[PDB]
Amino acid sequence: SHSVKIYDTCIGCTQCVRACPTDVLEMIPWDGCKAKQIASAPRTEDCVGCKRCESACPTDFLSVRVYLGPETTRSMALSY
Amino acid sequence: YGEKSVYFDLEDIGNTTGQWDLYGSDAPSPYNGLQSKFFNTFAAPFTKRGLLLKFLLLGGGSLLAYVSASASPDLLPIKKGPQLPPTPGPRGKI
Amino acid sequence: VRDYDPTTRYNDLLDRVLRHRDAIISHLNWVCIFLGFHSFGLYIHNDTMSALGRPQDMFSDTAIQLQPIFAQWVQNIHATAPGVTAPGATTSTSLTWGGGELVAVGGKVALLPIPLGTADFLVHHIHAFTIHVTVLILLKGVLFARSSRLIPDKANLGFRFPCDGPGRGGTCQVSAWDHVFLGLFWMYNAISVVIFHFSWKMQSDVWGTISDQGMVTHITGGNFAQSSITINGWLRDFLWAQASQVIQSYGSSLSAYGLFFLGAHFVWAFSLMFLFSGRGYWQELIESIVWAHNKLKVAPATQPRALSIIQGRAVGVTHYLLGGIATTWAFFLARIIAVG
Amino acid sequence: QAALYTHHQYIAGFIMTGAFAHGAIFFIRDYNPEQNEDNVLARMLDHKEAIISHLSWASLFLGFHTLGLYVHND
Amino acid sequence: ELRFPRFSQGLAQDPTTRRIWFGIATAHDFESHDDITEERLYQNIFASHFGQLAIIFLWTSGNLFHVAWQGNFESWIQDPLHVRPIAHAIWDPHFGQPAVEAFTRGGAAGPVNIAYSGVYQWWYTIGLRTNEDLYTGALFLLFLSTLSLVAGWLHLQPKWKPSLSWFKNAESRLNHHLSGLFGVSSLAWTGHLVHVAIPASRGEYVRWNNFLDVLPYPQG
Amino acid sequence: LNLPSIFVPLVGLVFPAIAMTSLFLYVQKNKIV
Amino acid sequence: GFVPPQLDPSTPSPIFGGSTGGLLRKAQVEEFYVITWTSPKEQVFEMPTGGAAIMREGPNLLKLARKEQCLALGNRLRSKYKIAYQFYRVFPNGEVQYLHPKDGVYPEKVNAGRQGVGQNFRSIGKNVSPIEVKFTGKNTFDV
Amino acid sequence: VVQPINGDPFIGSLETPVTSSPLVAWYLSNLPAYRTAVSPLLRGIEVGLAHGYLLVGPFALTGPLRNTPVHGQAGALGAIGLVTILSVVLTMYGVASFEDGAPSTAPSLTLTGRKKEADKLQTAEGWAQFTGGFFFGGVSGAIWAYFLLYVLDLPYFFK
Amino acid sequence: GDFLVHHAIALGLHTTTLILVKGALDARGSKLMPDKKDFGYSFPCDGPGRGGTCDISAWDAFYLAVFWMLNTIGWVTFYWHWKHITLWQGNVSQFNESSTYLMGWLRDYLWLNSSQLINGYNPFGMNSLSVWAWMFLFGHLVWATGFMFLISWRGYWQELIETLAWAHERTPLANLIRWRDKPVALSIVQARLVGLAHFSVGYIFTYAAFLIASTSGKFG
Ligand code: CLA
Ligand code: CLA
Ligand code: CLA
Ligand code: CLA
Ligand code: CLA
Ligand SMILES: CC1=C(C/C=C(\C)CCC[C@H](C)CCC[C@H](C)CCCC(C)C)C(=O)c2ccccc2C1=O
Ligand code: SF4
Ligand code: SF4
């Protein structure tokens, strides 16, 4: 399964959560930014590794990172 | 399953996924009794896969090697050998 | 991608076709494999048999024969058409059908009957192979434009996009534009083989000179039948033999064709740089060059960037096609002008 | 003689590419910045833009003028 | 350790054909294997290097044996400018008779290949003259190839495994390899040239049965 | 005896068969221990 | 707090003629997925597996092979139509696991009670070099 | 004439006249590979006989010895060698797939849903019986075709 | 002519060094990917964001450099062979006059020295060069096959493979046989490797056939 991590430069814009095609990420309360929220990745066994979340992030450098790992049926997107 | 436009079930889950044998048949043996008895006698030793594998491999290799060794010159040009005087190379090379 | 909409403009036939695309594509895949084997493997078998000193085991007119009987039958029907099925016509539509007769103008052959044999059978099934493969690629592109088992929401990504990421095992070249990009190469292959077949057959069996007594001498003297049944024959008797005019043209009025021959080889090889590589390397290199320009106060406001992924593929295929086609153009024109 | 010269030149080319491959592997897997502070190996990483740009200039000069002379003669 | 590959659990749980390909491609990347330590890396590398030596010796011995068995070294010795040396005989059941005739060359009685590696000139320059010498060389190299495997097996047992600090003694290794592997080998080869090859280039045949009596130089 | 006639088939046909059989059966094992 | 609903196996399916893009043998041996929703009226929609279908008025239940297909269909149902949906994973033994929406609220709206997973409280530029974790089995990105 | 398979469109296929006509179902249910209530030995014997009988022709008519007085023997030997290779491959597949004592993985449901006993063929012992039968029948079928073609010399068409 | 070809060889050395050095010095990161060292030596890419990041790892720089290495060594060996072949025939003026323009290289080296090689077998018979002639064509084939892996990428092939899996699971008398490793298309890095390998093998075999046949047909 792939690994997904969130770093504390997040501004809580929620774009990565909206971009994910298999519902890996979600927003949770926080106090470190003006939006009072931060992203989280509790369901990485369903991650396919597409990196749309990285494409959506506006900070420099990124606040969400994806490291590809061992492959499974779910992570290879096999319907057979 | 199949009633009132329903194809899902938590009990008969096999039919929901469609685990069927479309062409599988359940009919008795149509072979003759004496023929079946004959074919059930002389085909016994080959029914053990571990022994059959070694028998097939070793016997096949032995047969192939022997047939290669005993092949007749009138059938294999490589066995026959050259029959013409050699042609010379460039610059008088032999 | 842009206009299909079953909520406002429904069509039953399009839906029915979209509902058995797996069956369609799988059967086309299989027939491509079958044709490729039983057409190109025959040439491979002939090359092997000829190299091993066993010419009596080849597929040829003097050996195992594969005659194109249906084509010969249609030719015979067309050649004898004047008189029974078309009583109002004096002669047939073409001199190639048959009915032994030759027309000569200025001591040169115009047209005459064209015979068909094992070599024609082989090359026609090669043409069938190339065309069916081109159809496979382009039809796959059109039919799976909106979705597939791999990318369920492909229509939201558009007609022209590079990929959808390294996940799912890797998803480079899933867009329809990439299917067109791949189809251009196979189209080039097919048409090149068509024009090579035409050139060799016409030079070997039709064009030539005729004497006062009526002895026809052909340009390559009827070597197509025996030599075109191996790949070594195409390499030796067609490319190497007929390239002499274009490569000896320097110092005469045809030297421009030699210059274009070389320049087109250059462009073709140039395209491979774009085809084989990727844009991350080139952007990283541009960063170093921009540092040097910044050192001397000459960094432009319009910030340099490497070509996009799609533009890289487009530039590659464009220069590949231009180089190959121009090479063949120069070859043909020098050969036919000098020897014809 | 032809075979020997060609054979050993191709083998040499493959070896030369491998040298830089394993050298690149060194920088990722084993290099420790803290224990190499301000030595020659770190300063190499420090002026990489200058190094790469001057190599690029040399390649451009050679390519332009050599290809140009060949085309002029043709 | 569940299934192939035993050295990678991440690959071993992969349910696709990708398990097989990658299993082949990462076999010799010891650093990436599961539960590897620094010491085992060096020890396994040592064993693998012994394996490479064994394979090299086998390759050379095969060349010598085949040249001796099927070549024309003795014939080539007497007319080196007009005779083509023979690499090995050809036995191909797919051949036709014209190929059988065409590939019979060099004075042989069957189809052959001509050698372009230059081993005939090399082996003639260093004093070899007959097929018996070639056979003895091939057998000796066969012995060395077995010695390499036995040593590799021995240095991989618990009693005979070198420690990690042994592999990192740079000064001692440099001394031994400069003095012994380069210099002494050169001394031994110079001795061979003085005792064997140079006399052979003058009509004198020195072998293992008479080399003590003959003097390389009259004044010793 | 003609040694090539016996040894060429053994190395070109039978040995590959045995080796490929063993490797296929090895890579298909559900558990190795 | 939130009690996920129970999967009713007697829900009708949309009106479809069939295709070659649906379930294969994996659903028999490993797992498959089920999406349910409610429609105000019967209407046409594009299937994620190719072609078109007609959803009925009332409850609708559809079986799919992968989670991504369920989410894509749900996003179409939420953007183009004003319809709420849910989906589940089903095992060969008949076990059902409720998947989405997990706690009754959409993931892009911040909701209390959620516990963070996989958060590193530093900037990405402060990860260590690989040599610092060599021969240990750890990752430089793991906290 | 095209309908969903068993009324279930959402399975990954749709019934056609090809895959649902009773004429095809009768023929496919009368084949040795689908006689679930017959011992694997005889089912393998029939398969081996038929395939060994058919494999004789190509080797005897297209080989490198086709224009020699011993072409029939060469063709028969080629058929026997191919049968040996196929039997080896069958044994390897059986060893790789089925473990000793494991239950049959054959489907246990019919079109109507009625449960049926699983096929013994998908087991470690049934597959071995089928393989032995295939080898024996293949050799016998090759020998029979050779005997009919080049011993009695029956009057065929282009033999 | 020697002046011109030596400056071409210098171009080859400088460009190959540029590619490899840029790969090595940017391995740990750059402006486009400042955290590259976390992802290792070989990885496919970093996705289509930030403009697109195809071929960004150091492994990919090695992959690009191998092409330029083959180009440079080809120039070196072409020059050696043509100069010596005109030396051995006693016709140095041929090289001295034809080498100053590129059509001279195409016509007087490549085209002229192939005539014997491509007649190893023909409609009239065969001779001892036939194997080399066969090998020549073999090379041209493998080279070209490599292009397929280098130009077309993975997502095209995976979609195709899914359809074949559907077809096998639906075919009678053949669905009684099941696979145990699920078939998938090759990985991105794997495809780059396979394509480069076919390219290199074809390169080598083609040139070896031409060199050996051309020289031994004239001199033995
Ligand atoms: C080094 C490997 C090798 C060897 C030794 C052979 C040997 C042979 N090949 Mg070749 N072949 C090879 C590789 C090899 N091939 C490869 C890799 C390919 C694919 C590219 C081919 C493709 C090929 C074709 C297409 C043909 C041959 C044929 C032949 C035969 C030509 C001689 C003859 O007149 O036979 C005449 C002999 C016969 C007609 C009867 C042979 C009967 C055999 C010996 C029975 C063996 C039985 C035994 C149980 C087998 C055990 C196998 C295994 C379990 C160990 C000969 C047996 C020809 C042939 O005749 O094939 C049958 C033929 O048509 N080969
Ligand atoms: C010379 C180069 C070359 C070759 C040989 C191929 C071959 C193939 N391509 Mg590829 N392709 C190439 C270049 C090439 N391509 C390039 C440059 C590109 C980039 C533009 C592509 C892009 C491309 C696409 C997009 C597609 C193909 C497809 C195909 C397949 C066509 C089906 C077929 O004929 O199967 C029959 C197989 C052959 C003709 C291969 C030769 C077999 C020989 C003659 C016999 C071998 C005998 C025996 C098995 C030997 C065993 C030896 C033993 C030791 C192992 C086939 C595997 C299509 C496909 O998959 O169709 C199904 C397809 O969709 N190609
Ligand atoms: C003394 C020499 C030496 C040694 C001990 C090593 C050792 C190592 N190298 Mg290095 N390397 C060398 C030379 C060496 N290398 C050279 C000369 C090159 C330049 C080509 C490289 C380029 C290189 C790369 C690019 C990489 C390594 C890597 C590796 C690791 C092994 C990877 C593996 O298991 O591959 C398994 C082997 C294979 C999959 C086989 C590949 C064979 C290729 C594709 C060609 C085969 C074609 C075949 C012969 C065709 C025959 C056809 C026939 C008709 C003739 C290991 C640390 C890897 C590493 O450390 O990554 C972190 C890595 O990525 N090496
Ligand atoms: C024949 C093919 C070919 C050619 C000509 C080039 C040329 C170049 N490559 Mg490329 N490359 C190729 C194939 C080729 N490559 C292949 C197959 C690969 C493997 C994937 C690569 C991989 C590669 C890499 C990785 C790198 C290069 C680099 C370079 C540059 C080297 C320096 C040089 O010579 O600058 C001189 C420039 C030229 C000779 C280009 C042509 C200039 C023309 C003739 C000028 C006149 C144009 C004309 C007036 C325009 C008319 C057209 C229109 C307006 C009507 C150069 C631009 C390196 C680079 O960028 O260095 C800075 C580099 O890093 N190449
Ligand atoms: C004097 C003592 C001595 C000697 C003779 C050796 C010898 C050797 N050691 Mg070393 N070693 C020693 C002490 C010694 N060691 C000590 C004390 C330590 C501990 C500190 C080590 C630790 C050690 C390790 C850890 C390893 C070795 C290894 C090796 C082998 C290197 C591979 C090889 O064969 O290169 C052969 C090299 C040469 C013959 C010299 C190079 C010649 C060049 C190429 C020029 C040739 C010019 C010539 C004219 C060409 C002729 C060509 C011909 C065709 C005509 C070699 C057998 C390695 C090995 O493989 O072990 C199995 C290895 O891994 N050693
Ligand atoms: C070479 C190459 C480049 C680099 C090539 C570039 C950037 C093209 C540069 C084109 C011209 C030379 C740019 C300058 C144009 C100016 C208008 C020129 C002004 C001066 C004239 C008037 C003389 C890529 O960016 C790339 C991207 C993706 C895949 C492959 C590749 C690839 O192979
Ligand atoms: S890589 Fe794709 S699937 Fe994974 S978390 Fe990011 S957007 Fe979601
Ligand atoms: S390699 Fe390029 S095309 Fe392929 S997934 Fe990565 S960014 Fe997209």
From TrEMBL, chain A:
The keyword tRNA-binding does not apply. Residues 1-30, 38-67 form the 4Fe-4S ferredoxin-type domain. PROSITE patterns: 4FE4S_FER_1, 4FE4S_FER_2. It catalyses: reduced [plastocyanin] + hnu + oxidized [2Fe-2S]-[ferredoxin] = oxidized [plastocyanin] + reduced [2Fe-2S]-[ferredoxin]. [4Fe-4S] cluster 1 binds at C10, C13, C16, C57. It comes from the Eukaryota. Gene3D superfamilies: 3.30.70.20. InterPro entries: 4Fe4S_Fe-S-bd (IPR017896), 4Fe4S_Fe_S_CS (IPR017900), PSI_iron-sulfur_center (IPR050157), PSI_PsaC (IPR017491). GO terms for biological process: photosynthetic electron transport in photosystem I. Transmembrane segments: none annotated. SUPFAM superfamilies: 4Fe-4S ferredoxins. One of its GO terms (molecular function) is 4 iron, 4 sulfur cluster binding. It is a peripheral membrane protein. Binds 2 [4Fe-4S] clusters. Cluster 2 is most probably the spectroscopically characterized electron acceptor FA and cluster 1 is most probably FB. Its cofactor is [4Fe-4S] cluster. Its EC number is 1.97.1.12. Pfam families: Fer4_7 (PF12838). One of its GO terms (cellular component) is plastid thylakoid membrane. [4Fe-4S] cluster 2 binds at C20, C47, C50, C53. It is an enzyme of class 1 (oxidoreductase). It is found in: Cellular thylakoid membrane; Plastid thylakoid membrane. Keywords: 4Fe-4S, Chloroplast, Electron transport, Iron, Iron-sulfur, Membrane, Metal-binding, Oxidoreductase, Photosynthesis, Photosystem I, Plastid, Repeat, Thylakoid, Transport. NCBIfam families: PS_I_psaC. The cyanobacterial PSI reaction center is composed of one copy each of PsaA,B,C,D,E,F,I,J,K,L,M and X, and forms trimeric complexes. The eukaryotic PSI reaction center is composed of at least 11 subunits. This is Photosystem I iron-sulfur center. It comes from Avena sativa (Oat).
From TrEMBL, chain C:
Chlorophyll a 27 binds at W30, H38. Chlorophyll a 5 binds at R160. The chain holds residues 411 to 750 of 750 of the full protein. Chlorophyll a 28 binds at H45, R54. The keyword Glycosyltransferase does not apply. Its main location: membrane. Chlorophyll a 26 binds at H27. Keywords: 4Fe-4S, Chlorophyll, Chloroplast, Chromophore, Electron transport, Iron, Iron-sulfur, Magnesium, Membrane, Metal-binding, Oxidoreductase, Photosynthesis, Photosystem I, Plastid, Thylakoid, Transmembrane, Transmembrane helix, Transport. Chlorophyll a 31 binds at H78, T85. It comes from Avena sativa (Oat). Chlorophyll a 37 binds at Q311, H319. Chlorophyll a 36 binds at H293. GO terms for biological process: photosynthesis. Chlorophyll a 32 binds at T85, G88. This is Photosystem I P700 chlorophyll a apoprotein A1. [4Fe-4S] cluster binds at C163, C172. Chlorophyll a 30 binds at Q75, H124. The chain crosses the membrane at residues 23-44, 121-139, 180-200, 254-276, 320-338. One of its GO terms (cellular component) is chloroplast thylakoid membrane. Chlorophyll a 35 binds at M273, Y281. Belongs to the PsaA/PsaB family. Chlorophyll a 34 binds at H132. It is found in: Cellular thylakoid membrane; Membrane. Chlorophyll a 29 binds at F70, A71, H125. Chlorophyll a 8 binds at W329. Chlorophyll a' binds at H265. Chlorophyll a 33 binds at H124. GO terms for molecular function: 4 iron, 4 sulfur cluster binding; chlorophyll binding; electron transfer activity; magnesium ion binding; oxidoreductase activity.
UniProtKB/TrEMBL annotation, chain F:
The keyword Transmembrane applies. The keyword Transport does not apply. GO terms for biological process: photosynthesis. InterPro entries: PSI_PsaI (IPR001302), PSI_PsaI_sf (IPR036357). Keywords: Chloroplast, Membrane, Photosynthesis, Photosystem I, Plastid, Thylakoid, Transmembrane, Transmembrane helix. May help in the organization of the PsaL subunit. Belongs to the PsaI family. This is Photosystem I reaction center subunit VIII. It comes from Avena sativa. The lineage of its organism: Eukaryota, Viridiplantae, Streptophyta, Embryophyta, Tracheophyta.
TrEMBL record, chain I:
Chlorophyll a 36 binds at H198. Chlorophyll a B1 binds at H140. Chlorophyll a 33 binds at H14. Chlorophyll a 35 binds at M148, Y156. PsaA and PsaB bind P700, the primary electron donor of photosystem I (PSI), as well as the electron acceptors A0, A1 and FX. PSI is a plastocyanin-ferredoxin oxidoreductase, converting photonic excitation into a charge separation, which transfers an electron from the donor P700 chlorophyll pair to the spectroscopically characterized acceptors A0, A1, FX, FA and FB in turn. Oxidized P700 is reduced on the lumenal side of the thylakoid membrane by plastocyanin. The PsaA/B heterodimer binds the P700 chlorophyll special pair and subsequent electron acceptors. PSI consists of a core antenna complex that captures photons, and an electron transfer chain that converts photonic excitation into a charge separation. The eukaryotic PSI reaction center is composed of at least 11 subunits. This is Photosystem I P700 chlorophyll a apoprotein A2. The gene is psaB. The chain holds residues 515 to 734 of 734 of the full protein.
